[PDB]
Subunit: 386 residues, 4 copies
């Protein structure tokens, strides 16, 4: 019955089920949750673990005595439940000091502070066993053209990531970084707005092997992009270090719906790709239970994330294993797409009259791709109408 | 009076002013143009040169005798006018054989043909003096999830670009490649949909130094992205090999309006950045005169592209040179954004109590960025209201 | 097995399966179809009937002898198959004369011609038994601000529709009009861009009872709008005279995918609403088989439209009939939403201290809406995971 | 120098300059403002007046003694400055009780309360001299399909507006209502999402003459719609009771930038239309100074709204008065667009062989519209490049 177990590796941010429902036009609709109670509540649902921002575990401005007791209580809930902490991250967006950014703030002292805050939490992340450290530069960007020279800001962004990579190397940590793109909100435009921009930026770091992406379903969809396509490119690059799952109904504010909501067909093709590719990291949900809900609806929504992943996994596997689909894939030439165009090499291609001079372009053009039958088989599988 | 001269390097595709106005719901509204007459007509307007697809110079399926006479006539118009041909490209989208792509077609024979067609035109491009060879993979992509394994397709795309780079190296040509991203249309989703995705892909080629981007204003805006930001990232990467200028009114079909139309403020900030950065390549217009127009309106629209570039150039230069704006930039800390965050190095940063333990975050947060005054100075400059 | 029969009332435009695959960057990939063969082919698939533009039945500029033989051949295919023609429409977009519009062309003679062309086809539509006459003003609009005074254009649009309503009244026809909104493409902005704008405009006609809407799934989604919501408003207004079904993957060019493709969840909620409301008109598909397909894929895609409608109909009915869902609807107060707010009347409301002075807003606010559990039941039903 | 005076009728919501900068990912960056100080500060800038939500003048849950003193202090600032209060509105979105809506909440008691809260503030609005009472139903809508039957919700919405119209009639007030559309945010989809949907809904009210629209620039642009077009339709309907001015950079979260920011060309065409139409209501700014700013930047941003309106007013007037533009308008047939298509009547049109049988469609089609020259004259005027 699509019941999750910890071996499914489902994880959740403390800030997700813990979202109090404050939006830019409304006050909180739910009380804050003790992280201890979310660990317990999630473990009961079948989750594998939790993630946190530094401020989602230890309230900003804590004395070290308080910090110690916050951590201690959290550590006991993990031990009580068997939950893990595979990823953590820094809040560089909530406090007003970060109103123009953390790593790319125009104010140099803020940039320095953002790094000092980030490094403190990396140490804590390692202590709690995280393998991935995410950065979402939600305040990096601008509302107006003169406010941000983006060439200078990317210099400042490279600087920061290079320093964090020097730091983890100096400490001998095994943790790796994952940049989480978003195209806008809360800034008018955010730097590194998509998976492609983040991938490209990483290739300009001193130690590129230490940084990957953490793409979020709804964020690429906020640019009207195909999320499964961007995940394929991240996988092709060897850079899918982590993944954020949720739903989004098109180009609008970041909704962070429960996974499977939003674009259901894209959710199907995403799961198909993650499972085909053997992605083995956490299946992490970054989602807000809608503020219409009380705490029972919070946990229902969380359960739904996991349930929908496992239904889509079953339907995609059944699609890929159906001999009628395999035949259709053959009919649509997907096997040909995986064979080299010219393993025979450039000269042989140049000398191959069958590639140009005697190529029958009209017979090739007349050959239908048969993609609509293939896609209606995929639809039939998704809906259990086979 | 904002009169262009060839030294402004303005160029135009033959397919732009030559667009007959056929759209997906309407027939042609203008006759086809002889490329000779467009070269002459553009030179009279002050353009520096023209670009072409192979099929926009030599009709598909020409005998070599016909090909020779087409080229000869074009060459004479160039010589008659002093016009140049700085860029050329391949039509891998119009013919039905390319209905599932050229380089990433599922059919291997089509992929081979696409390369054979591309290489033939590279030789011609070199003969006519082009320094940049553009690729727009407008048919590379899918309408449905099962039709295109994107991992395999990027393998096929890398293959193709690697082969074209082996070819130009083997011939000793100096020409370089520029990939032109577009997120969708005519395919439901197009591969390498944005500047970031193209930049990232190039870093996976055998000879990355040979490939840059040719970003188009309207295409990044079709993903709701900030075009000046993406140009800054391309410039930061050292990869702005060429630029396509036009206008776009938001997220919708590719309009290819005359430059300055669409998002006027973004046009201002683009020109500001190109001129600040000392971009020295062609200012190339990829635009469709609307099909409401007759041939006089075609040439009016072309003239307008150039005029609007030169007005925005003047207003941006005046903005950057105004001592009141310089002071505002200082007030908004843009100078600080250009200074290293931590040239003193990681350890010094770690030991700097002013970066954390004794950082006054409340006083930093209280400091306004003054970006609205800066932006109203930019507005006043753009509108000539100073 | 979700097999359609004519009693399902599925209809298709001749221009849908007959689309030759010409897009704004590519030539045709399929030959044209004889309307006779599409009637036969669709009847074999289980369709109820077909619709046409005047130019999709009789080629533009036909002699009346030719027109007669075209009609005669079509009439025989209808009789041979039992197919019906419930709707027809005018092509006021393909010919270059309509480059600035038909009814709102700036040129008065074109406006007159557009009406003369429209009235000729209304007579033919009546002869073939249509009950609905659609208008899609795809060329009505502008690319630039000065080109179209929209106040004057709406005067010209009202004029035209008023004249067509006088005409059908004068002839004693029973046919009714349906305006099909689209927000853009082929014009930069199209007038009456959404269901709401069309509904509002109709209330300004001389005979409002004669005009409704024909909303198309993909067009409202091209404005990022909720198609089921707009259909509910059209139904609430008593104005859903006809409906166009297809799919659309977000805000981009009009894709006209096969129904069920695009936004699958929205397709579910649409079918739920049409069936709940007892909509009894044609279930009309306005769709393009992708130009990757040959004619077998054309018919596969058409079959898929019908299949997906019938699967979604079954799943929605099962949702609405499930006692667990009924209970959830009760828990989410949907029954309360259908009860008058204040049947007791204004004064009683004013005097009801329970409505303000003694209203417990905190207890009301604390009551969760339970919408996430309700929606996961809807998801479970859609996917057959109950 | 584009200095505003109260006769320009510029108004501002207390919540605009008073926005503390709390966004869905960040805390406040500015303290709250005393409404008294905003009235004074705005009057010094040249504003005509202010508007308020009930909760933006009197903190929620005030004793009547407190309410009295809040009002008294506000009244004295108005008298001290000569500022007016032309519009007011109800906060039916911030308090958690309104998490599923006010007038269309599923909970009947909340719907009753929303009306009781609305009516209390209408009385206060009248006392302070407002002529327009706005409703923005920002919580009316849904995130999921089953949560909201939209047919029932529109019944509940009609009910509420009908009751408020009975109330103001019963009291003999002269105030009129204006519905402010928004397509989404904070709900996933908001009911009456555009100007067209609101216009259409009003025609279903018992007393339609009492309700108009208050369209907001950024909200229609959040649906990718042309704001000047929707204003023209509202003006054509006689329903532009009020207007909200700001800027928006495309399809994304509601930015509420200072007017003239966002889409500058659309701002030009809007002002052109308001001034051409002789719109005489308040020019009301609904805008957020970005949270990067301190209070000096708040007032700079407010000043900028007014400045940009007055620059665009000058440039549009100069466009409309330029004899070269008048000639171009004549060349593009805008005069013809304003002449009836068929004042000669239906029969005369039917009998006019020049309208069909002898219409030269090819010569008509060959006539260019000359819209690009017209639009480059508009551009030259906007930029002061004539
Ligand atoms: Mn998100
Ligand atoms: Mn995330
Ligand atoms: Mn383009
Ligand atoms: Mn281009
Ligand atoms: Mn369509
Ligand atoms: Mn349609
Ligand atoms: Mn707004
Ligand atoms: Mn507003």
């Amino acid at each position: 019955n699509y019941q999750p177990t910890p071996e499914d590796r489902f994880t959740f941010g403390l800030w997700t089920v813990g979202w109090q429902g404050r939006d830019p036009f409304g006050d909180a609709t739910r009380r804050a949750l003790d992280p201890v109670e979310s660990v317990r509540r999630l473990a009961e649902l079948g989750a594998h673990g939790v993630t946190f921002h530094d401020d989602d575990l230890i309230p900003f401005g804590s004395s070290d005595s308080e910090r110690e007791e916050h951590v201690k209580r959290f550590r006991q809930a993990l031990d009580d439940t068997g939950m893990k902490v595979p990823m953590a991250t820094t809040n560089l967006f909530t406090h007003p000091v970060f109103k123009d950014g953390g790593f790319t703030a125009n104010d140099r002292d803020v940039r320095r502070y953002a790094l000092r805050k980030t490094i403190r939490n990396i140490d804590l992340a390692v202590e709690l066993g995280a393998e991935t450290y995410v950065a979402w530069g939600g305040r990096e960007g601008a509302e107006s053209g003169g406010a941000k020279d983006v060439r200078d800001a990317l210099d400042r962004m490279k600087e920061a990531f290079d320093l964090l990579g020097e730091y983890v190397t100096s400490q001998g940590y095994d943790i790796r970084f994952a940049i989480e793109p978003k195209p806008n909100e809360p800034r008018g435009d955010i730097l590194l707005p998509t998976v492609g921009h983040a991938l490209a930026f990483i290739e300009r770091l001193e130690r590129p092997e230490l940084y990957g992406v953490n793409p979020e379903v709804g964020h690429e969809q906020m640019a009207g992009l195909n999320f499964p396509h961007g995940i394929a490119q991240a996988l092709w690059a060897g850079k899918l270090f982590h993944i954020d799952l949720n739903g989004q109904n098109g180009i609008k504010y970041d909704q962070d719906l429960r996974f499977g909501a939003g674009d259901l067909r894209a959710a199907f093709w995403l799961v198909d790709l993650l499972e085909s590719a053997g992605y083995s990291g956490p299946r992490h949900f970054d989602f807000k239970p809608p503020r219409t809900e009380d705490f029972d609806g919070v946990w229902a929504s969380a359960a739904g994330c996991m349930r929908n992943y496992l239904i889509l996994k079953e339907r995609a596997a059944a699609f890929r294993a159906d001999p009628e689909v395999q035949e259709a894939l053959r009919a649509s030439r997907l096997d040909e797409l995986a064979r080299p165009t010219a393993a025979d090499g450039l000269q042989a291609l140049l000398d191959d009259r069958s590639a140009f001079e005697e190529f029958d372009v009209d017979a090739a053009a007349a050959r239908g791709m048969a993609f609509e039958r293939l896609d209606q088989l995929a639809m039939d599988h998704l809906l259990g109408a086979r």
